[PDB]
Design a protein around this ligand. Structure first.
Ligand SMILES: *[C@@H]1O[C@@H](C)[C@@H](O)[C@@H](O[C@@H]2O[C@H](CO)[C@@H](O)[C@H](O)[C@H]2O)[C@@H]1O
Ligand SMILES: *[C@H]1O[C@H](CO)[C@@H](O)[C@H](O)[C@@H]1O
Ligand SMILES: *[C@H]1O[C@H](CO)[C@@H](O)[C@H](O)[C@@H]1O
Length: 44
């Protein structure tokens, strides 16, 4: 009843803590989003 999750997004921050998200749609109530922590670099 679900499409595949999208790829995880880039980190919302280019340094320091941020969020990454992905989403899936029905193809089943409605769309779903998953969110996680990310940190790709220390800020200067
Ligand atoms: C993405 O690239 C990084 C290397 C930094 O230049 C980022 O800028 C910094 O972003 C943070 C918020 O994530 C701000 O607190 C700083 O002011 C800023 O230098 C950039 O967005
Ligand atoms: C998304 O989540 C996982 C892949 O990370 C699987 O359960 C499936 O592909 C779903 O669409
Ligand atoms: C999110 O997580 C895996 C593990 O890195 C990624 O490779 C993929 O893009 C998925 O969206």
């Amino acid at each position: 009843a679900w499409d595949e999750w999208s790829p995880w997004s880039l980190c919302s921050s280019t340094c320091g803590r941020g969020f990454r998200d992905r989403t899936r749609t029905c193809r089943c109530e409605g769309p779903e989003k998953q969110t996680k922590f990310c940190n790709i670099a220390l800020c200067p």
